[PDB]
Design an enzyme around this catalytic site. Structure first.
Site, PDB file in Angstrom:
ATOM      1  CG  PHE A 137      -1.680   1.227   1.250  1.00  0.00           C
ATOM      2  CD1 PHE A 137      -2.954   1.616   0.376  1.00  0.00           C
ATOM      3  CD2 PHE A 137      -1.362   2.319   2.292  1.00  0.00           C
ATOM      4  CE1 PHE A 137      -3.447   2.625   0.701  1.00  0.00           C
ATOM      5  CE2 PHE A 137      -2.186   3.261   2.345  1.00  0.00           C
ATOM      6  CZ  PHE A 137      -3.276   3.525   1.414  1.00  0.00           C
ATOM      7  CG  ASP A 222       6.000   3.667   1.803  1.00  0.00           C
ATOM      8  OD1 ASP A 222       5.938   4.427   2.513  1.00  0.00           O
ATOM      9  OD2 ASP A 222       5.085   3.513   0.904  1.00  0.00           O
ATOM     10  CE  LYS A 251      -0.665   6.420   6.970  1.00  0.00           C
ATOM     11  NZ  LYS A 251      -0.010   5.540   6.130  1.00  0.00           N
TER      12      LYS A 251
END
Lengths: 392, 392
Positions: A137, A222, A251
């Site tokens: 994702f 990532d 985030k």
């Protein structure tokens, strides 16, 4: 309350959230309009690693908002410099390129990887390839979504973006085979998040990097979800002692107060961008920077990385005691933990809500356990016990 | 104050900004470390329509920052609902879909158009087309960038996203010829910003809209820059009394305090999205929502739309008094103004910086004039005199 009807009236149905409304939050606790308290075991998908509304981070937001919040990238702010320098030191990389969301930063990686492949690796024009992993994702933008191996995220979204190859996760031979002389990069999560917190074999990241090194392929990590102390180390790559060719952060980079992301790599990679080639309107604005600087200071000053390391270990050990056949495996690094079941997990997620714990299933079989890294020992112990009552 | 030495060291080269550092901004005025005040005639590329740090918007930032800032879309917030409603009433559209950046809202539009073209229009699988205009700027993400007709924003960024067709701007006939039974949507800026504030012929949007309705093609208007009072009207489509099949909003939607954007359309279009098909971590968070709600209240309560319409007309009239063969044309709507020259515009932008006015030219020969919509008559008059000194 009536907030849900109102939402259902004018709200696009791209989400179907639990019927619960959060109107307050501090640290690891959240509260509804009626006043029911819940403990956050989702950490907003790891964006609030420093807890909800961390005072040092909130005060940062408040202080920069007294000065300036948006200078177009046409001019300088007085926060971007310091932020660059703090992120550059943390990643031990030469340049940093700020964006707003994870996807944007991933998208930035796509662009960066490709131009590098052409300008520098001299790969055939328009023939560059990017290896990705199954069940990954990386975002929802067209570039990121084109990478997913979930056809539900890709159904009827028109012609996807070419030049993407997918291989099984944690597979070194798949990687070796997929690589061609046109391969630009290999983008993967150090630990797959939504895929069910599946941890690759030990040293794989060190082995994967060596393969990419030999083949002159960029190793892009990532770490939007796994980075910044979440997995018990500053970066999840640190577990295999790996320094990737490019970090992707997000985030928690902004403490869940402001959306800020970035790509960090050395001048031989990022340097491919000349003025005007890339950017955004808000990327690297002084409000995000001031808030990010504060969010990173909280990390180190309060040793949340080490706090995550130790408590995460303890809890995984406490959980592995619960005797039940239903539990296929308890796995995790730091406070990034998952519990796999041979049954669906939603029912037990509902049972945990009723007891005062909020978390969401990913992949049905697995229950997420990702509390803020500021969580006290007592609160963590109180949590363990509620989990034991439900899963035993 | 040599912050730049710090930015250059660890900063990526996708931006080559003026040597000036802004440490404080308020209203239409910005200020460097030394103390020098300038007037922002750029409004952060039209994000601070309400001026820099509007007290009521900063006030909404604080109020909401004392409750909760990030709830995952896995749960409700008490700000999203009211925000949906305020945007639905403003657009007069049935549903809204929140994102963070304009590029994201554009990417959302892309995905929507295609899914609607397949699901509703029943176009041939993976054959959906999208019409765009030459010199368009829709973003930096792979989807948006794929729409560019500028090869410099596209150089060495690998295989571009397929299914995009490009026609001249303000060309009703070109549009007609480019539409096929597989065409999903037609995405355009009611006025092209970066292309040099070039306005389409009067009633062009109304005609194009009709061409689209008769062909069952979505008329998507990118109002990220033109929208929210910038052009003297709530939307730039309002000049041709046009209601688009879908709005795309951003920048000023958050008053330059928090990056928030959205796609607005009726349920027969956004209803296309079932739960899990799209989203983003920070998209529609309570903090962005509280801030956006205040941003919109300021717009209407202070009647910035009309204040922009009247001052914009007055200024354009005044600028047209300036006699100089150098000036090819002065054009604009509300305070969205551009002065085209037959020479490069950069030199005159420098002279203006020395005169206390900050802007950046686009398309080489066009001087952007776009101060915040809160600018007082006096300060606008002062600005005109400075511009007159430079361009006369």
């Amino acid at each position: 309350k009536d907030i849900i009807e109102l939402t259902d009236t004018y709200g696009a149905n791209n989400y179907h959230p639990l019927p619960i409304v959060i109107s307050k939050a501090e640290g690891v606790w959240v509260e509804d309009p009626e006043g029911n308290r819940y403990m956050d075991l989702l950490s907003a998908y790891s964006a609030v690693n420093q807890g909800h509304r961390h005072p040092k981070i909130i005060n940062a937001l408040i202080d920069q908002a007294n000065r300036v919040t948006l200078t177009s990238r046409a001019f300088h702010s007085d926060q971007l410099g310091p932020w660059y320098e703090k992120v550059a030191k943390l990643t031990n990389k030469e340049m940093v390129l700020p964006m707003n969301t994870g996807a944007e930063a991933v998208e930035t990686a796509i662009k960066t990887a490709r131009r590098w492949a052409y300008d520098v690796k001299k790969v055939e024009a328009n023939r560059a390839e990017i290896i990705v992993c199954e069940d990954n994702f990386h975002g929802r933008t067209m570039g990121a979504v084109s990478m997913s191996s979930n056809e539900e995220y890709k159904r009827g979204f028109g012609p996807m973006l070419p030049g993407i190859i997918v291989i099984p996760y944690g597979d070194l031979e798949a990687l070796k085979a997929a690589i061609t002389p046109n391969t630009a990069a290999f983008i993967l999560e150090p630990i797959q998040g939504e895929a069910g917190i599946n941890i690759p074999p030990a040293g794989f990241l060190k082995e994967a990097l060596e393969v990419c090194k030999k083949e002159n392929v960029l190793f892009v990590a990532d770490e939007i979800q796994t980075g910044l102390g979440r997995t018990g180390k500053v970066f999840a790559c640190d577990w295999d002692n790996v320094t990737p060719d490019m970090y992707i952060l997000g985030k928690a980079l902004g403490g869940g107060v402001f959306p800020i992301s970035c790509a960090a790599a050395n001048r031989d990679i990022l340097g491919v961008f000349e003025p005007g080639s890339h950017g955004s309107t808000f990327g690297g604005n002084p409000l995000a920077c001031a808030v990010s600087i504060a969010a990173l200071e909280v990390l180190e000053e309060e040793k949340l990385t080490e706090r995550s390391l130790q408590l995460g270990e303890k809890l995984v050990g406490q959980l592995k005691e619960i005797d039940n056949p239903m539990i296929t495996e308890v796995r995790g690094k730091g406070l990034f933990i998952g519990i796999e079941l041979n049954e669906p997990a939603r029912p037990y997620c509902e049972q945990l809500k009723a007891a005062g714990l909020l978390c969401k299933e990913t992949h049905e079989n697995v229950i997420r356990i990702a509390p803020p890294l500021v969580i006290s020992e007592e609160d963590l112990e109180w949590a363990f016990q509620k989990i034991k009552a439900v899963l035993s």
